[PDB]
Design a protein around this nucleic acid. Structure first.
Ligand code: ADP
Lengths: 80, 109, 96, 96, 443, 85, 97, 109, 96
DNA sequence: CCCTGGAGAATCCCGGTGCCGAGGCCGCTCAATTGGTCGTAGACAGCTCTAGCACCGCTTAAACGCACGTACGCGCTGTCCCCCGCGTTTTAACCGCCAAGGGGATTACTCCCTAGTCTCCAGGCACGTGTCAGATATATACATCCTGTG
DNA sequence: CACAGGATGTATATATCTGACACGTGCCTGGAGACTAGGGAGTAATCCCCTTGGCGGTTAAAACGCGGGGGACAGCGCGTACGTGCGTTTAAGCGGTGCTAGAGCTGTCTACGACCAATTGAGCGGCCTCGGCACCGGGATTCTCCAGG
């Protein structure tokens, strides 16, 4: 697969920014925020896949994701 | 013969399981030995915290004309109270949204 | 049937009925409360274990839990939690 | 005809999305992105639905907090538009 | 085998104590022993040292670095005495900042054209690194009770030096016990007195002290200066004082030194926070009643006003001194304040105005341990001690600040004591120390 | 009746000292209002750390605060301090 | 007539000098008195070791240096050279304090 | 008889106390049972990390023309290296100083 | 005599002499190295214990230590450390 | 040029629906109950050595106040490009349903690993020792900045 | 506008002093060799849950383009607050009484409470079932915003 990062489209980023509380958005914000999302996801997925490899499983689980998020200090209440 | 059993929660007038807390403490590799009063104290602390959060969330849910407490109500109660915000500063509550906050500069003149 | 699993759901429901007599909760909020109780348990227990390690004591006691709640809970929450725990310990020592 | 001024629709959108509590990124594109990222670390990985949902929740919260800090930086710079420089300053102050 | 002043001295005939001390020092040197000359004020220790140095210079040639360790306040006096009595003897002084000290040492010390060097304690501790290469022949120390104790940087460096001869100048060789006397004796003779020290005491102490000490007491040397007159006054404290005392005894106020809380607490309670009345802070009749000793002092004050003059007040606390100053101000009475916080220029102005022939100066509030060996008060009549320190020798210095050869009439001392307090034990220790020192040295 | 307090200890963190800290941080020009704010920030940080350290000292039944107590407090705060234990 | 440096050369020289040195910058006696006053409120009759005050001074120095760095970054972002309490407050807010 | 005693550290070719590490793991309340390869692995990892840090610190000292390492050299080694900086991104090194860092706008022009 | 305390000073000295033939180290730097080794040991052991508890087991093993190393260390250091620890365990189990 | 009107949105009130919470029943496993026991903490005496508090010198570095002038922060103008709001068309998400298989989850076996003991001894820690690396001082030599002048 | 001179700050050597780091030895306690027993985990095998892949239809959403206002950004001017020097002034820093009792650490001894073990039965968790709450849709009240006079 490729190019799927472009699937995080401009209207979605605008909705997220509006929830954040911004009013005017520059044109170059979208590539920067896509990069930020990519690095965040890479960290989380790296840790989750390592947890799953230790578990000797081929399925990544909500518990693995929560453990990774806790290890990074972003505890997620509501998934186990 | 043997007397009727009484739970340690009943002896302490608690609503949280003292026996379960003691079992988790002993099985959790926290220390070699665990005292009698540590589970009671910890259960009381947990009960107080749960009661505080539930009371604030219930007030929030009642103010919005509901009867079910939902994650939005929980997040409202946590983020509108400073001490609970400090306690849960680095916690994401699933499907909780954000508090209404529009900066005064952005408002129309 | 699935293998049994633990939960604080019944005790959360009891406290909820004590506080708000006729207000219910949903499954998502119950899961959030379960996770919150687990997290507070983990943090307090870890602090107590570190205290016991530092003081070179092999037992976890009410003194350790009191010091842990003072360290972790901020301010008036800590004060009220300490008072509630002392009351519970007094009642347990007296009644038993 | 009729044409709202440039910015009142934005404020209505801000109010509405701050009141709402649902997800904003399309689930199938997010899932495809997650699979593509996991392709590098491991081959033939399967995912539970709750895992993808939790990843989505965490990503949304992280981006929302980052955007709030970016708007604070933009206000500090005597501006209303947010810029990549503001995002980078927020990231640098956070320490990432 | 010197009963008379030699011919090389200028402006001096000596009163035979100088020649006796010089003969004793010469005999000790010939035997190869360094001792302590323990004369206490009025018998010319500086004059004895000057005579010894002039003797060494003029007679069999023994030139070398001559060290004169004196308090910084005495440098000018020692220089004046050196230049006035023996002009042939050549002396220099090392003082100033780093630049001045470096310039002076590079111009004079390294060439070594000098004969005598006069330095202070702090200059010595600073310039030890330069005062090590030279060979030391005779080391003269005034007020030897500065190095009276083992350990400290000054004691270590003074024990570091390689000196052919040593000489100590002090008035009170024994202060608290035998330990400081043994320390000085070890400094004199490190091998002889290596031991750490009525058969095991008293008699052996006298036997040890006889060959290595020689002191002549002013009382038996001057045959003048009529004696003292001490009055002991017992003081009951106010009820608020007693309840504060009880609170301090049993126990949000700082509590670190119970001994020195009860101390000032028996002296004046307003030193504590909150003891004084509210925002008015008006001085009227609550300064007196709230302190029992203050009551007695306030009663004696009109008596001192109506009879005699030149009263001296000694206290050990700056807070008590300032409170007494404020009280004397409220009573619209003249006072003069001298303490360690008062710089030298104002010190001199105050003492000059005080010794002025016809002055209205009534109160001279003098802190006991401020200043060194100076301030020649002779017209003073009444000496009052609000408190007494641990050292009876320090108390003796305080009482002899007014008790001087210029004084012609007997002077009176009034002591105020607080009952049911540790002040009784302090007075007992001071009195036993004074008795021991008198029965050991005075006779 | 003659008393005169000296100063508050927050003023002991002098303007030249705050300037030296700013130089080490890498700033060139400083406003005049920075000093009071920096004093307040220092007070807040010190209060948090000292509260944690006093808690540890009290628990150990000790009346003396220790470097290990300070290190434990900083580790709790998330400010690990190497070089003292 | 007398020689003078332009407004900013001495500042940059000081920046280099204090970024090269390793010693502390605040005064031991005032810092110790401040620590004692702060701890007196939490509990009276407290004794402090010598190493505790030094450790507190080290931690405070590191924290203040990091804070000033972030403050300067914010002030440069605002296209200034002067730092201000606004920059301090923004740095604290973004760091989460 | 018996066999001549040789340490497990020298047995695995290390310079770190495998026996002491094993004792610390067993006494630290981490798990109720500890294996045999775990202390060896942990000692090897600690040895590698110590070698890396000491290598960089010695290089910094030799660049600064000295023959003894000080906390300033340790700080210079920890910073200027991305991976060690990320690992020690929350560690304060006592009397370690700060990296030279002057922004371009503050330079004269 | 006085009491006795434990430190990694001698082993740090051995590694220092190995990696730099003539370069000493002072007291403060040695204390910092002791603290660093203690902190890394604490982090790795805690991560291994949490892994064992998550997977519902009771033995800390080389698999747990390797996973903890991968989760803790950032990348290149992680792979180098894993390789050399695997080498050490291989040497230990080869002929011993 | 505030006041007014049109429109657009937001809001409130009923009415019908779907489902998720709430209650009730069954089995069982984990907590309660006694009883015996062994370390672990409490309690107490002795040492001792460091931390207090109120003065008293003495020295030197760092603060403190000050005047001047100069960059710098701050406000105002004006251009202009970029972002916003709206209508349209294309795209793909979203929602149901279906089929197949991989893989998670459980259970039973069995063995090999680790905990626990006991000797035996050597690696490590404390205590005492001595040479050198580093800080400092002082005097050159070098580099940098600032001002005046052709 | 640029160059050249001068003042100041800084880098660089050599010589001294010193106190700490590197080293040796002796003693000790905890690490190592040799043994045992028990139980946790590795392996094999089986069930069924959940993931993946697929299709078809619908409609909300995204992409695209267009027209226009407002906000970013460069520039200009002002007048003020901060940096750079200087002469006083505290106050830190160090070193001394002068006493101290006090708190932390080691050794010894003893009691009590936490653990372990066996037994037993309520307390929970999982399975059902049913009704009130939330939701969706429709229809009819304000409230805001934007031209236009
Ligand atoms: N040359 C002298 N001969 C006799 N008595 C003297 C002499 N000089 C001073 N005195 C007296 O001795 C007292 C203090 O003398 P002091 O300064 O100790 O002498 P020195 O300086 O020689 O030690 C003074 O009050 C003075 O009256």
């Amino acid at each position: 697969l490729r190019d799927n990062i472009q699937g995080i489209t401009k209207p979605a980023i605008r909705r997220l920014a509006r929830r954040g509380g911004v009013k005017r958005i520059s044109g170059l914000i979208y590539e920067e925020t896509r990069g930020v999302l990519k690095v965040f996801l890479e960290n989380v997925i790296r840790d989750a896949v390592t947890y799953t490899e230790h578990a000797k499983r081929k399925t990544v689980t909500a518990m693995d994701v929560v453990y990774a998020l806790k290890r990074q200090g972003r505890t997620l209440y509501g998934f186990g | 013969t043997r007397a009727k059993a009484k739970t340690r929660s009943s002896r302490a007038g608690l609503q949280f399981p003292v026996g379960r807390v003691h079992r988790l403490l002993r099985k959790g590799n926290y220390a070699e030995r665990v005292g009698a009063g540590a589970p009671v104290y910890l259960a009381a602390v947990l009960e107080y915290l749960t009661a505080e959060i539930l009371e604030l969330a219930g007030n929030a849910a009642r103010d919005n004309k509901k009867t079910r407490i939902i994650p939005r109500h929980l997040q409202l109660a946590v983020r509108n109270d400073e001490e609970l915000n400090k306690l849960l500063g680095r916690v994401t509550i699933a499907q909780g949204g954000v508090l209404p906050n529009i900066q005064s500069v952005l408002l129309p003149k | 049937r699935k293998t049994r699993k633990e939960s604080y759901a019944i005790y959360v429901y009891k406290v909820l009925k004590q506080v708000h007599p006729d207000t219910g909760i949903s499954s998502k909020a119950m899961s959030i409360m379960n996770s919150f109780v687990n997290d507070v348990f983990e943090r307090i227990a870890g602090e107590a274990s570190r205290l016991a390690h530092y003081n070179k004591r092999s037992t976890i006691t009410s003194r350790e839990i009191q010091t842990a709640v003072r360290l972790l809970l901020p301010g008036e929450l800590a004060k009220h939690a300490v008072s509630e725990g002392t009351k519970a310990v007094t009642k347990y020592t007296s009644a038993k | 005809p009729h044409r709202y001024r440039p910015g009142t629709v934005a404020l209505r959108e801000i109010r509405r999305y701050q009141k709402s509590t649902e997800l904003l990124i399309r689930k199938l594109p997010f899932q495809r992105l997650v699979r593509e990222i996991a392709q590098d670390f491991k081959t033939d990985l399967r995912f539970q639905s709750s895992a993808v949902m939790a990843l989505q929740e965490a990503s949304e919260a992280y981006l929302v907090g980052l955007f709030e800090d970016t708007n604070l930086c933009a206000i500090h710079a005597k501006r209303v538009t947010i810029m990549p420089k503001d995002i980078q300053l927020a990231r640098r102050i956070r320490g990432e | 085998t010197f009963e008379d002043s030699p011919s090389y001295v200028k402006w001096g005939k000596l009163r035979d104590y100088q020649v006796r001390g010089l003969n004793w020092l010469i005999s000790l040197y010939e035997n190869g022993i360094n001792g302590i000359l323990a004369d206490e004020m009025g018998l010319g220790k500086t004059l004895q040292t000057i005579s010894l140095l002039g003797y060494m210079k003029h007679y069999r040639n023994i030139p070398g670095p001559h060290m004169v360790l004196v308090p910084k306040s005495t440098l000018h006096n020692w220089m004046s005495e050196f230049k006035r009595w023996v002009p042939t003897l050549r002396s220099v002084c090392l003082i100033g900042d780093k630049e001045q000290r470096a310039a002076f040492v590079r111009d004079v010390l390294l060439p070594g054209e000098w004969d005598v060097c006069v330095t202070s304690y702090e200059m010595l501790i600073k310039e030890k690194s330069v005062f090590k290469k030279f060979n030391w022949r005779y080391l003269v120390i005034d007020e030897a009770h500065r190095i009276k104790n083992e350990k400290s940087k000054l004691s270590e460096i003074v024990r570091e030096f390689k000196t052919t001869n040593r000489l100590l100048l002090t008035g009170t060789p024994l202060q608290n016990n035998l330990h400081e006397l043994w320390s000085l004796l070890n400094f004199l003779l490190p091998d002889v007195f290596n031991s750490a020290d009525d058969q095991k005491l008293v008699e052996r102490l006298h036997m040890v002290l006889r060959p290595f000490l020689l002191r002549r007491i002013k009382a038996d040397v001057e045959k003048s200066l009529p004696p003292k007159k001490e009055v002991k006054i017992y003081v009951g404290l106010s009820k608020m004082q007693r309840e504060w005392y009880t609170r301090i005894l049993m126990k949000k106020m700082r509590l670190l030194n119970i001994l020195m809380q009860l101390r000032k607490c028996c002296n004046h309670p307003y030193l504590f926070d909150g003891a004084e009345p509210g925002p008015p802070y008006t001085t009227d009749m609550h300064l007196v009643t709230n302190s029992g000793k203050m009551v007695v002092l306030d009663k004696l004050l009109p008596k001192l006003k109506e009879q005699g003059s030149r009263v001296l007040i000694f206290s050990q606390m700056t807070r008590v001194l300032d409170i007494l100053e404020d009280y004397c101000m409220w009573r619209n009475y003249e006072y003069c304040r001298l303490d360690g916080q008062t710089p030298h220029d104002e010190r001199q102005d105050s003492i000059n105005a005080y010794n002025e022939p016809n002055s209205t100066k009534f109160v001279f509030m003098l802190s006991t341990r401020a200043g060194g060996l100076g301030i020649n008060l002779a017209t003073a009549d009444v000496v009052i001690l609000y408190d007494s320190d641990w050292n009876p020798q320090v108390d003796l210095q305080a009482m002899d600040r007014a008790h001087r050869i210029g004084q012609t009439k007997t002077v009176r001392v009034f002591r105020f004591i607080t009952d049911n307090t540790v002040e009784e034990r302090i007075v007992e220790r001071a009195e036993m120390k004074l008795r021991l020192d008198s029965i050991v040295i005075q006779q």
